[PDB]
Amino acid sequence: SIAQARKLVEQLKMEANIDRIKVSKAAADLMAYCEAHAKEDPLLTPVPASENPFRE
Amino acid sequence: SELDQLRQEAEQLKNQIRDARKACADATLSQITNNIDPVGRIQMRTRRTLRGHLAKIYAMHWGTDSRLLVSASQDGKLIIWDSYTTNKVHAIPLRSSWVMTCAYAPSGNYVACGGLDNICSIYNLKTREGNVRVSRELAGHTGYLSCCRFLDDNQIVTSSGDTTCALWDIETGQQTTTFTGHTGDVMSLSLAPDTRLFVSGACDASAKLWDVREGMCRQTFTGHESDINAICFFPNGNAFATGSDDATCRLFDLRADQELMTYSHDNIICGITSVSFSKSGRLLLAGYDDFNCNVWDALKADRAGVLAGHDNRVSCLGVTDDGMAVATGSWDSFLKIWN
Amino acid sequence: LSAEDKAAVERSKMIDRNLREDGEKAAREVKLLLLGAGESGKSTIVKQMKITGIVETHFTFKDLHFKMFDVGAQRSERKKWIHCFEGVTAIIFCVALSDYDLVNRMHESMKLFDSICNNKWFTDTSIILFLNKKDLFEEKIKKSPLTICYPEYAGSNTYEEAAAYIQCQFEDLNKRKDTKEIYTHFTCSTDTKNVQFVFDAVTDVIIKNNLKDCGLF
Amino acid sequence: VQLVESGGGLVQPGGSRKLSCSASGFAFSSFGMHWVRQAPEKGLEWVAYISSGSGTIYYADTVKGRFTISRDDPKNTLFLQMTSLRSEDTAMYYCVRSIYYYGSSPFDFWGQGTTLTVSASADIVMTQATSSVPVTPGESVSISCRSSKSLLHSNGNTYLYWFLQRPGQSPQLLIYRMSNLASGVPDRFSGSGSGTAFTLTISRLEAEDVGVYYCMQHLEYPLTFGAGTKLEL
Amino acid sequence: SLANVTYITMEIFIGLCAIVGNVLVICVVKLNPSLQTTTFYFIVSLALADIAVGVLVMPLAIVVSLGITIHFYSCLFMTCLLLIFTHASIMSLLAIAVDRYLRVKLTVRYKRVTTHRRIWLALGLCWLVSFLVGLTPMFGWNMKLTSEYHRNVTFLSCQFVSVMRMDYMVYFSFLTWIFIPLVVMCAIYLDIFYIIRNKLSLYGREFKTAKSLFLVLFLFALSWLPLSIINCIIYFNGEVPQLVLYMGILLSHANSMMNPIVYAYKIKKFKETYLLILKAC
Ligand SMILES: CNC(=O)[C@H]1O[C@@H](n2cnc3c(NCc4cccc(I)c4)ncnc32)[C@H](O)[C@@H]1O
């Protein structure tokens, strides 16, 4: 009875009282992290054949 | 007392959670990302081809050095591929050919193998005798294992066919932490870069986050309407994308606790089998049930690239830690390198 | 050119040769997948031919190495891992006729057979139907009529007639008659006729695949 | 891991003799074998090498055509047949196992070796800067050596190996590829180099460091060992 | 004179169609690895033989029919190349037939008795015996040994019969490498049909396989028998009309373009790749 019903209610209550952050701040942090590592990603910026180890 | 009280309690709790999420959601991701310049078309060329496998390749994993990789096929042979020289480094004969997942430790000493069998056996690659042997046998589960990953040189997370996940200690082979919060068959795992939290996607159209030390469920996401097949964590440790068979890939956030953006198309009606981010997280690579693979932009939700190098359903899509190249493997026994 | 990488290329070539040898050895053998409702009807079949997740049983008969894979101890969603069995040669589907009087199981067995024979991954894999507990069914025929679970059945309470009716009902569920072949055979505790029929069905599947590969037929 | 060699002793000049080596504790068919000879007055010297697949059998310029090497994997034996040997072949022979892959540690284990006594260019030269340097416990020693050409290959790997032969024991590998230490070796050693000039330092020297230090290059199959530096306690 | 121009135009058309079809077949085989098995190992050789007949035979046959004054040991090898390629195609068809026979007779150990190495060795032996049979006229079976007045033909005009002997195209070519392989393939098809009837008649599938075998045999006959018997009639001191001699060669060369339609189309898997590349590419 309570082995599969009370635990779900307890988990929902624990999840309801958790701290939440606005979506705008999260999106700003995500775009800042993407812009800061723009040149660091070899797939985003074009990498020359001399630097790329997978060159022919 | 009676179930009629707990049912309405859970109902009102879900209603309050939905109302709070609706009140906290003030703007969409598109309105804030419109000011970001799109990446445009990104052409990718096949650099290396690996045709050593004779059966359907299922999963692969990159190492710390981003040079050696482990590959598992239906024939039951773990192959260590060198990405630069395309040479077979090690060949591990499996006791059960019905495997569908593999793992590579960050230190580069041990590897994990699992699948339809209830054991994700550990194999040591740095043995003094030079031959490969079983290092640890995890025979505690009863359902088929979907994924196994290494948190350290002594702990390993594992997802089984039942609605449970396990944390095995390699030193003793016992379940350190058991997660029973899921309600469906756990299909995929994804660890955070901080090695403190990990989010798992199951067949119950939900993704659940768990602590590697506490073991309690923090947040639950119910944005999908079908079973989730693959999942990958964002390189920043705050978000993750989940792909399901409904041809939609939803990007959830830990701080936002809501689906940020969904990726789908009209002509794309097949499900997703593999999903992984790049080093910067700007590009999201997704393997579908068709003969092609897609590379979307994590911000503009546009098809930045299309890879039609395979002729079968894409099974695994691994990305290096430094983002130099990606490895795409399908059931056609071919593992290609793209960049 | 390289100093030590040539020995690595030689080792890779040797590993590739070993992998090709193992693949040829596996292709020399034959693999089959065991399915069906009920554990006893499958356990007796496993016991009749023999020299936890999935059980793997190897046995050599007429120079052919049969590898039976039993996934009855999985208890999970079948549509999530059945695609791994696309390359199997045959699907031995065993069901017990005695379920026609036990509580309703015959309808579940027929639904499972219809779902298996209509799968998109099994479009090129044949199914060998086995009807276990023939003596129990013959004894139950003289006790309860067949119309207890088949309202459309209307005939004499005969063992052979009921068996033919059940076989026809199981064969009519297959919508791929032009592609699949149903090898229905009554099996029980008897001599090696069961493994002989299995060998015959395997040879039939092999010759059908070879004729469909080299052309039309 | 154990290597037992036999078939040494006194030998007549111009005769024939087959050294027999037995391996245990590891996969014999997976590891290639090397034969290294050490003179009673000179240092080590490579003789022959056989691969794991019994292919690409190469010999040194001084022993080309005279010696023969064979292996038996089902029998787990190594046969080194030397026929019509000269008087300058009296030395102690050692069998060394090796394996070639990314991250491997070749020449990790050395056999016991057997002493055989005879009754009465186009190679990389390793010039050693010193022959004997006295050391004290707790101090540091800097070993240097030069090669004929830069060992820095196009892949960035420097084929340099440092072995330590203790008095009365078989040599052991300390640092391989100039950037990785073998298993069971303390991390107090430090080897570095720019391709031509190499430097090996031993921090916190102990009593177990007494022996001879040999340097080896692996750019070509005709391996040539150095003169060796003997440290006095 | 217009009949010769029409014959040359139809020969050009047949050669171009055969070249296009065989190039498409080779591209399908090389592109999609899902069919790179023991089945297409003979289809690749057949496509190569048909490409050879379309490239190094059809323009060569036109040049020979023109009657250009060339060297004796120039056109002799030029015309012997035609026999080489035709015998290679015949050997490829015989290999396909014997493979279909082994797939129905050695079913229980097929992949155990014939690996890829044995198939490549059989193809090499077929090509070698084809080259050996096709170079026999250059070894002494030419017009020099026929009668006098020959071998003084440094600068003479070449017309297929001017340097080749008719007895070779009957006894050695037809009665050894055309009629005997035809009878072998007929017996193989009859045995396959009997085995299918005995193992299936316990109707549409039987009709389909019988129609396929009968169509293959009928196309092979219509291709090879006409000029083969035309040559026999010429050898018997008879007479053959000029237009029938060209019609026979046309029907014979139509085999190179009708083989992919009667062999590669009835695979039930090559057709899928064909329609896939037709809809996508
Ligand atoms: C098995 N190999 C063949 O059948 C080849 O032989 C060629 N081939 C035969 N016969 C030819 C001919 N006829 C001359 C002729 C014949 C009889 C009388 C007279 I006067 C003149 N012309 C041009 N090619 C002729 C065909 O083009 C096949 O490819």
Residue numbers in the entry:
A (entry chain C): 8 to 63
B (entry chain B): 2 to 340
C (entry chain A): 5 to 55, 182 to 233, 241 to 354
D (entry chain H): 2 to 121, 135 to 247
E (entry chain R): 9 to 210, 222 to 300
Question: What does the original paper state about this entry?
Answer:
The adenosine A3 receptor (A3AR), a key member of the G protein-coupled receptor family, is a promising therapeutic target for inflammatory and cancerous conditions. A1AR and A3AR preferentially couple to the inhibitory G protein (Gi), leading to the suppression of adenylate cyclase activity and a reduction in intracellular cyclic AMP levels, contrasting with the stimulatory G protein (Gs) signaling triggered by A2AAR and A2BAR activation. Here we report the cryogenic electron microscopy structures of the full-length human A3AR bound to CF101 and CF102 with heterotrimeric Gi protein in complex at 3.3-3.2 Å resolution. The A3AR agonists CF101 and CF102 bind at conserved orthosteric pocket forms by ECL2, TM3, TM5, TM6 and TM7, akin to the endogenous ligand adenosine bound to other adenosine receptor subtypes.
For the CF101-A3AR-Gi complex, data from 20,779 movies comprising 271,323 particles was used to determine the structure at 3.29 Å resolution. Specifically, CF101 and CF102 have a 5’-N-methylcarboxamide substitution on the ribose group and a N6-(3-iodobenzyl) substitution on the adenine base. The side chains from M1745.35 and L2647.35 in the receptor form hydrophobic interactions with the 3-iodobenzyl group extended from the N6 position of the adenosine base of CF101. Alanine mutations on these residues did not significantly affect the potency of the compounds on A3AR, suggesting that the 3-iodobenzyl substituents may exist alternative states at the receptor extracellular domains. This demonstrates that the N6 position may accommodate various substituted groups through distinct conformations in the A3AR pocket. Residues H953.37, S1815.42 and S2476.52 form a unique sub-pocket in A3AR to accommodate the 5’-N-methylcarboxamide from the ribose. Overall, the two agonist-bound complexes were highly similar, with 0.593 Å root mean square deviation (RMSD) for the whole receptor.
